[PDB]
Design a protein around this ligand. Structure first.
Ligand SMILES: C[As](C)(=O)[O-]
Ligand SMILES: [Zn+2]
Ligand SMILES: [Zn+2]
Ligand SMILES: [Zn+2]
Ligand SMILES: [Zn+2]
Ligand SMILES: [Zn+2]
Lengths: 83, 84
């Protein structure tokens, strides 16, 4: 099926899992920062950036979730290849 | 803005660092996707490739947005610091 060694598959899996975790943490931190900025900057100057952040955030979340699913699949596949 | 220039710049740094980290993850994982896809015959990985490709441009746009916010914040901090 897959022509890659278990050892390399597991290294890839760590990259996907670590990427997922880091993207979730960045989105959490910057979501907090957006809130603090938006609340302390009255009026409209930052509004275009807020609108784009809100539109893109759910996609970034979706991407982190995908990465976690790829991690799980690669773990499974490494097991099967090795066994 | 009701925030000190120093705090505005601390936040700016976080947006920049986040952007850099996301672009690094995206570059690394795009290379992984290609290698895994190339070495997996049949349809098993196809759905993950499809979903990755659908979302990656939006993640790239998000990284770009964070750099734009970083520079907007820097410029705003400069203006606050100049306002007597
Ligand atoms: C190199 As940077 C942390 O200013 O985007
Ligand atoms: Zn390799
Ligand atoms: Zn994790
Ligand atoms: Zn604060
Ligand atoms: Zn006012
Ligand atoms: Zn940067």
């Amino acid at each position: 099926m897959i022509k890659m060694s278990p050892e390399e598959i597991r290294a890839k899996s760590q990259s996907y899992g670590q990427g997922s975790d880091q993207i979730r943490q960045i989105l959490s931190d910057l979501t907090r920062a957006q809130g603090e900025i938006a609340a302390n900057w009255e009026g409209q100057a930052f509004s275009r950036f807020e609108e784009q952040f809100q539109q893109l955030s759910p996609k970034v979340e979706k991407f982190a979730q995908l990465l976690e699913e790829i991690k799980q699949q690669l773990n499974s596949t490494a097991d099967a290849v090795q066994e």
